[PDB]
Amino acid sequence: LPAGNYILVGVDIDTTGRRLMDEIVQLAAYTPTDHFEQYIMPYMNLNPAARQRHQVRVISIGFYRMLKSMQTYKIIKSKSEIAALKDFLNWLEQLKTKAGPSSDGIVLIYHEERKFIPYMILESLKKYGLLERFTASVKSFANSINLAKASIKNYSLRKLSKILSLDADSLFDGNASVRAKLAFDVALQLSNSSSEALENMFNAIRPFAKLVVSDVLELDIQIFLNYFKTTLYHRVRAVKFRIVLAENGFGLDIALQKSKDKAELLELL
Amino acid sequence: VELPAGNYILVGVDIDTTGRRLMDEIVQLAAYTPTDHFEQYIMPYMNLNPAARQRHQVRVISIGFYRMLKSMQTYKIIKSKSEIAALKDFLNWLEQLKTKAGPSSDGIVLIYHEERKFIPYMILESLKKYGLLERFTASVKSFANSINLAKASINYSLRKLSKILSLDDSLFDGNASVRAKLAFDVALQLSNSSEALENMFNAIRPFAKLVVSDVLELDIQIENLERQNSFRPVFLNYFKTTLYHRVRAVKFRIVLAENGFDLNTLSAIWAEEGLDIALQSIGRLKSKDKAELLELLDSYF
Numbered sequence: 001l002p003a004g005n006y007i008l009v010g011v012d013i014d015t016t017g018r019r020l021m022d023e024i025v026q027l028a029a030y031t032p033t034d035h036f037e038q039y040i041m042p043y044m045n046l047n048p049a050a051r052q053r054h055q056v057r058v059i060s061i062g063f064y065r066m067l068k069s070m071q072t073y074k075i076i077k078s079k080s081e082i083a084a085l086k087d088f089l090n091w092l093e094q095l096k097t098k099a100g101p102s103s104d105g106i107v108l109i110y111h112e113e114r115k116f117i118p119y120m121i122l123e124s125l126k127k128y129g130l131l132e133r134f135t136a137s138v139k140s141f142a143n144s145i146n147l148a149k150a151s152i153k154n155y156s157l158r159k160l161s162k163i164l165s166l167d168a169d170s171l172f173d174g175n176a177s178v179r180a181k182l183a184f185d186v187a188l189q190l191s192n193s194s195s196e197a198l199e200n201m202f203n204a205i206r207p208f209a210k211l212v213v214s215d216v217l218e219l220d221i222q223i224f225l226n227y228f229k230t231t232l233y234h235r236v237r238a239v240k241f242r243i244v245l246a247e248n249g250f251g252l253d254i255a256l257q258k259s260k261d262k263a264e265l266l267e268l269l
Numbered sequence: 270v271e272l273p274a275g276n277y278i279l280v281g282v283d284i285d286t287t288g289r290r291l292m293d294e295i296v297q298l299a300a301y302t303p304t305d306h307f308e309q310y311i312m313p314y315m316n317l318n319p320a321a322r323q324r325h326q327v328r329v330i331s332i333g334f335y336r337m338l339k340s341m342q343t344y345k346i347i348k349s350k351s352e353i354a355a356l357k358d359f360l361n362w363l364e365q366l367k368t369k370a371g372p373s374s375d376g377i378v379l380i381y382h383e384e385r386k387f388i389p390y391m392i393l394e395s396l397k398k399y400g401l402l403e404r405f406t407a408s409v410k411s412f413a414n415s416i417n418l419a420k421a422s423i424n425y426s427l428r429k430l431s432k433i434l435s436l437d438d439s440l441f442d443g444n445a446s447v448r449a450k451l452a453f454d455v456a457l458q459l460s461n462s463s464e465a466l467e468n469m470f471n472a473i474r475p476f477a478k479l480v481v482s483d484v485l486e487l488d489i490q491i492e493n494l495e496r497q498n499s500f501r502p503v504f505l506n507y508f509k510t511t512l513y514h515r516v517r518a519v520k521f522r523i524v525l526a527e528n529g530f531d532l533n534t535l536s537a538i539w540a541e542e543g544l545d546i547a548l549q550s551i552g553r554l555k556s557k558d559k560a561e562l563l564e565l566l567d568s569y570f
Binding site: 041042043044045046047059060061062063064065066068072073074075077078080082083127128129251254255 | 288541543552
């Protein structure tokens with residue numbers, strides 16, 4: 001990443017799962033001067049692990065689906081994914097505009113062990129053909145988990161929070177808006193240890209900064225055993241079984257409703 | 270008559286939806302010509318109201334936590350796509366259709382058939398969501414309601430016309446692909462009472478609206494809807510009595526809005542006692558206040 005006058009924004013997302021084929025439920029961004037968050041209505045419902053992590057679930061009142069916070073048991077207002085991304089893109093542009101012509105874009109800062117957040121956001125932008133507009137405002141993604149390891153993998157955003165006393169019973173780390181802020185605050189105090197303090201932060205984040213194009217490239221690349229030995233009839237079907245299961249993201253009988261052999265072989269374990 | 274003369278391709282078109290309001294979703298998109306046809310089911314974010322399930326014999330189910338479409342005729346899962354993907358499929362189909370007509374063709378006229386204008390508005394609003402509307406107008410030049418021919422040649426619903434023209438059956442007219450073909454064939458027969466398509470075009474041309482015209486109408490329909498989407502009629506009696514009711518009236522209209530609850534949304538839920546759950550999930554609404562809202566919302570129906 002080349003040097004210059006960049007804006008720093010912490011980002012994180014709540015999702016229905018940890019796979020690329022899963023969906024975004026919340027998109028959150030933070031700066032000390034401005035913050036953005038929007039809940040998004042997903043196609044699918046949240047699995048048990050997703051409801052546990054974000055404490056949000058989809059409920060149905062007949063035809064009407066809605067997000068409900070498990071904390072307050074109240075309704076979360078939400079938008080479509082496309083609608084929220086436009087709101088996100090409009091918000092990012094205001095940030096760059098507010099910095100003047102001198103600003104050379106925005107650097108999004110996230111904090112996680114496995115690279116996932118940037119891929120999901122980019123995959124959704126490439127979904128609706130909004131990547132070009134995004135490139136105008138944002139110039140790089142940068143993982144901040146590296147600074148922790150450098151100044152101390154197995155450095156959870158929750159653990160660091162306790163160290164710097166940023167943790168609060170009032171703040172739930174399952175919410176993306178909290179993690180976006182904590183990603184920033186953690187990256188702020190460690191980069192240092194007002195205006196001047198931020199200057200130190202860019203320089204500390206530069207090494208781990210990656211160009212958007214680099215991720216878009218890494219995104220594309222990221223995007224029945226016993227049967228293969230016996231005979232041809234079995235071999236063709238196993239490849240069919242491996243492909244069909246993989247596409248759908250892999251009650252057993254109901255989904256299939258021939259395929260019982262898959263169920264018996266799936267019953268086999 | 271605003272459609273200029275030219276070498277246009279006639280394509281019948283229709284859609285399946287979760288409802289009959291502009292804020293609803295397209296479940297299936299269908300387009301027909303005698304030589305080529307297009308159909309694609311689309312997963313909605315919400316579900317289908319009982320009317321939609323009844324009309325199209327399609328519904329959403331939940332296997333585990335995944336949602337997916339299901340046929341109420343065959344009881345088999347209906348493979349579907351995202352809307353943006355189905356539209357990119359549509360445009361490609363419309364574009365290769367225009368290519369096969371040579372450089373002489375001046376574009377495509379989409380033919381739909383209905384008494385209440387709806388189809389063109391929905392398809393445009395969907396294209397608008399993704400900025401695909403500019404690309405759409407490269408292949409398509411007009412939407413045209415062919416119901417006008419029926420009034421002249423003989424309400425005149427596409428089902429009523431199917432029976433009068435003996436076009437009816439095994440084909441279920443709750444499927445968009447069927448109605449697309451029927452819209453096309455109805456108009457073609459009436460226009461004739463190569464040479465066959467010339468008569469068809471000459472007949473629909475007077476009712477063929479330019480895309481721009483319908484986009485302008487769409488914005489008016491949207492504006493009229495959002496004006497029509499008010500709680501003012503429900504809280505009319507609150508303003509006549511006193512200030513106490515006046516303030517609480519506005520207070521109620523506010524709470525509902527913060528939770529994405531419109532009158533059409535709440536009206537729909539009652540039609541499909543369910544209000545209680547809808548009102549219970551509302552935050553910053555006190556228990557005693559809820560009882561009043563339910564009483565008020567159960568009334569007015």
